[PDB]
Design a protein around this nucleic acid. Structure first.
Ligand SMILES: Cc1cn([C@H]2C[C@H](O)[C@@H](COP(=O)(O)OP(=O)(O)OP(=O)(O)O)O2)c(=O)[nH]c1=O
Ligand SMILES: [Mg+2]
Lengths: 106, 702
DNA sequence: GGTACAACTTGACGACATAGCGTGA
DNA sequence: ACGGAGTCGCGACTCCGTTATCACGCTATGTCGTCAAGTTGTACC
């Protein structure tokens, strides 16, 4: 599809050594700002297609990765330069703010 | 008659200096100021007042002032200073006897009290209530240290005598005098025809109500119990603590390998709205929105101002106007009902019984009632209940703030205070070491907790032998009181029937109940008017079965409804009905007891409890006072160096640590004779019975 | 350009007030 | 004073009900006061 839904094993095997810009969303079922930011991410997955990797990760059905990275607030978008953490921001941004954040890292 | 007050350097365990003592006399109407060097003259003035047949009045003198003066007189002059019982009058006991209900009258006056004295029987609280309070010595000393500049220590003001402490003692004496005159302004408890400030001690103890003498004898006996104390077994408690800590770690490991962790939404501050319109939505947990943040920082260079050079990136990782959900990685705590309830929802169980704030009832009944599809979690529910029980035992024993290992002094003896009046019904309450919280003989490890409590842990001061503990209990107290009340209705038939075997065992056979204490719980719930849901919860069945048993016992004993109707027509005027409340007019706020107190009533369906609990409390109180008086007059000696000591008066049951089994048998026979004397004195229409046991600890004595 | 400054904000910490629930009689 | 329920001749008309009780302790959890420290607009030379 447009945004790849990952698990912990798929994250560890196809993110840390994927050699590309990877953006991972952290989302829960009961909230809710992720429901706000998800059509924005669906629009960015078509606007900036062919230059980065956009993915989502459920913190509820995958209890491994999020305690390893230590997340205090959701939603939080992490930019992965060759898998490792390069820059991130906490909150539910807008489309222009997210495009500015992606342009401020490339 | 004189009114005195003292000032020591510490409490009863560390008193070593007499600062000042102020005496007011009615025959002179003058203030008698003393010095730290006037301790012998103070004791000689007290002995002259006793020899003149006068009455000396203190404030909480039975618990602190009299043994403090005794210990100071011993450790300073080595002279035997022992004041008689009848020549000492407490204002605290008279205040607790006359004004027995402060919580229902202190509001409307809080405009006076600072706020911390809400329902306080202290000496300063009456100083604010009587509008006679000129500062506080502790606040004056704190202001003094903050004026000098050095730091405040809470014990330095009781180390040095000064004019501030002298004037504070004068203020204490005049507040005690005004409070004594206010309590002697009463008409029911004290007849105003005789000026009680100018009588003899025999005239004062004879020309008043019996309740004042009962209260003062009870206060003297409880102060003797406080200076006696109760033994302890430190090594057994520490071994039990190590065992319960190891089992707690074992069950915590089992529950952490059974269950897992999750995320908790705790941390939100601001408000979330509808993203389309702006309407608030209660269907989301609390989230937070920052107010300062962005992407680029402030332009400082010339090309940054021109937009050529990009500014610094957002390091703080928050943007102004981006709502997020501040969560935390909560670990599953089995001591958290909310966590247990969350896991039972995730297991697939639907809660039924709810509370008033939305969260469902989580207790032992519903933890037995939960039936899920997973056998491992179904077995782990029992581990959760056992973890909660062991956590309760450890929090009672050592890890709590009011811990036994924290409150046992250097002699190995527990020193826990007891309020004589306490509740409004007359039943005594227990202070910060609470001896009522000690578990029974069927709870897990409560047998070891009661086996760690015995009189065998105190060796003799001369021979060095473990003593013998004697425990005496009464059976069917309130039930025989009920027979005494409704004998005038049923011609004494229930009082004749109650003496035929054990009434609780007979009710257990009649109701087909498993245990005798379950039968006791059921008959007490039927006596005090429980609802059908409560009766079904006790019997383990439905409300139809509860109504069947209620109607069966009500048709068996029809006089209870007649007694309730008699009380309802006696003290209650009318009763209105609100949808959430119940406006009931009485025009009679109290019921005269056996001695004649104004025992305050709270509820029209609790006036029966207000009667029966006060009756049982007065019977037990005058019973132990008469038992102590008879054991004194038969020739024995009360104390550690004597023969016996009182160490437990929790409810309707005493523990007596004697020297030999023959002495314990004499104490049991004396208690039986005192019980028969009370039953003959108060015109008891039935027979009163006791039950004495003889064991080394509570494992045999109860 | 520069430079002090002052309320705002973020995060942490401690005292305090309920909440069912558990012991006893 | 409206829900639970006994009843009039199964729907509705109408009659009844409505607390277990005093003590203390406690770990969980939300509220709010207090404080350390940047910070970001900002006013003027
Ligand atoms: C146990 C219990 C007692 N009480 C009150 C009423 C009782 O008369 C009083 C003391 O109860 P108990 O002393 O336990 O009753 P008992 O004297 O008949 O039996 P035993 O000889 O074994 O001691 O406290 C309750 O209100 N609810 C209770 O659950
Ligand atoms: Mg008893």
């Amino acid at each position: 599809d447009k945004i790849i839904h990952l698990t912990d094993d798929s994250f560890d095997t196809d993110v840390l050594k994927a050699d590309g810009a990877i953006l991972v969303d952290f989302w829960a079922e009961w909230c809710g700002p992720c429901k706000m930011i998800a059509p924005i991410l669906d629009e960015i997955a078509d606007e900036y297609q062919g230059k980065l990797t956009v993915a989502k990760l459920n913190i509820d059905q995958n209890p491994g990765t999020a305690p390893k990275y230590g997340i205090r607030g959701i939603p939080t978008l992490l930019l992965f330069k060759n898998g490792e953490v390069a820059a991130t921001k906490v909150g539910a941004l807008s489309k222009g703010q997210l495009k500015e954040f992606l342009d401020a890292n490339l | 008659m004189i009114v005195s007050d003292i000032e020591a350097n510490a409490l009863l365990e560390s008193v070593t200096k007499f600062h000042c003592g102020v005496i007011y006399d009615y025959s002179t109407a003058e203030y008698v100021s003393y010095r730290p060097s006037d301790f012998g003259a103070y004791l000689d003035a007290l002995e002259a007042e006793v020899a003149r047949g006068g009455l000396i009045v203190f404030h909480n003198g039975h618990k602190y002032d009299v043994p403090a003066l005794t210990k100071l007189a011993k450790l300073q002059l080595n002279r035997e200073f022992h004041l008689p019982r009848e020549n000492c009058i407490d204002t605290l006991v008279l205040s607790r006897l006359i004004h027995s209900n402060l919580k229902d009258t202190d509001m409307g006056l809080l405009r006076k009290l600072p706020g911390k004295r809400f329902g306080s029987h202290a000496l300063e609280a009456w100083g604010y209530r009587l509008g006679e309070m000129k500062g506080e010595y502790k606040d004056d000393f704190k202001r003094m240290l903050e004026e000098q500049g050095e730091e405040y220590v809470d014990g330095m003001e009781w180390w040095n005598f000064n004019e501030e402490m002298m004037d504070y003692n004068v203020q204490d004496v005049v507040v005690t005098k005004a409070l004594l005159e206010k309590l002697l302004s009463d008409k029911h408890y004290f007849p105003p025809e005789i000026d009680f400030t100018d009588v003899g001690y025999t005239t004062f103890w004879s020309e008043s109500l019996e309740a004042v003498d009962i209260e003062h004898r009870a206060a003297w006996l409880l102060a003797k119990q406080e200076r006696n104390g109760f033994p302890f077994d430190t090594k057994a408690i520490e071994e039990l603590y190590v065992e319960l800590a190891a089992r707690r770690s074992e069950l915590l490991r089992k529950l952490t390998e059974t269950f897992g962790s999750w995320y908790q939404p705790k941390g939100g501050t601001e408000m979330f709205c509808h993203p389309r319109t702006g309407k608030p939505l209660p269907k989301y947990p609390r989230i937070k929105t920052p107010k300062v943040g962005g992407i680029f920082k402030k332009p400082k260079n010339k090309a940054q101002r021109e937009g050529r050079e990009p500014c610094e990136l957002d390091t703080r990782e928050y943007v102004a106007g981006a709502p997020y959900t501040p969560v935390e990685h909560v670990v599953f705590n089995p001591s958290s009902r909310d966590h247990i309830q969350k896991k039972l929802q995730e297991a697939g169980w639907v809660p039924t019984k709810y509370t008033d704030k939305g969260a469902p009832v989580v207790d032992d009944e519903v933890l037995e009632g939960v039936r899920v599809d997973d056998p491992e979690k179904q077995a782990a529910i029992d581990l959760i209940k056992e973890y909660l029980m062991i956590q309760k035992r450890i929090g009672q024993s050592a890890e709590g703030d009011k811990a036994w290992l924290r409150y046992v002094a250097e002699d190995g003896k527990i020193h826990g205070s007891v309020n004589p009046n306490g509740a409004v019904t007359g039943r005594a309450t227990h202070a910060f070491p609470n001896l009522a919280q000690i578990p029974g003989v069927r709870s897990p490890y409560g047998e070891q907790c009661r086996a760690a409590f015995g009189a065998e842990h105190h060796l003799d001061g001369i021979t060095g032998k473990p003593w013998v503990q004697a425990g005496i209990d009464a059976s069917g107290l309130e039930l025989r009181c009920l027979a005494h009340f409704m004998a005038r209705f049923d011609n004494g038939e229930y009082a004749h029937e109650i003496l035929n075997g054990d009434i609780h065992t007979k009710n257990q056979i009649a109701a087909e109940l498993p245990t005798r204490d379950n039968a006791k719980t059921f008959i007490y719930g039927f006596l005090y008017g429980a609802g059908d849901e409560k009766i079904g919860q006790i019997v383990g069945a439905g409300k139809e079965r509860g109504k069947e048993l209620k109607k069966k016992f009500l048709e068996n004993t029809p006089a209870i409804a007649a007694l309730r109707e008699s009380i309802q027509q006696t003290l209650v005027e009318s009763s209105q009905w609100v949808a959430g409340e119940q406006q009931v007019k009485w025009k009679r706020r109290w019921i005269k007891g056996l001695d004649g107190r104004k025992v305050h009533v709270r509820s029209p369906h609790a006036a029966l409890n207000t009667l029966l609990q006060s009756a049982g409390a007065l019977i037990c109180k005058l019973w132990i006072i008469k038992t102590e008086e008879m054991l004194v007059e038969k020739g024995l000696k009360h104390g550690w160096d004597g023969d016996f000591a009182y160490m437990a008066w929790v409810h309707d049951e005493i523990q007596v640590g004697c020297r030999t089994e023959e002495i314990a048998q004499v104490v049991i026979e004396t208690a039986q004779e005192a019980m028969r004397w009370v039953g003959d004195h108060w015109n008891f229409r039935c027979l009163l019975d006791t039950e004495g046991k003889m064991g080394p600890n509570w494992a045999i004595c109860h």
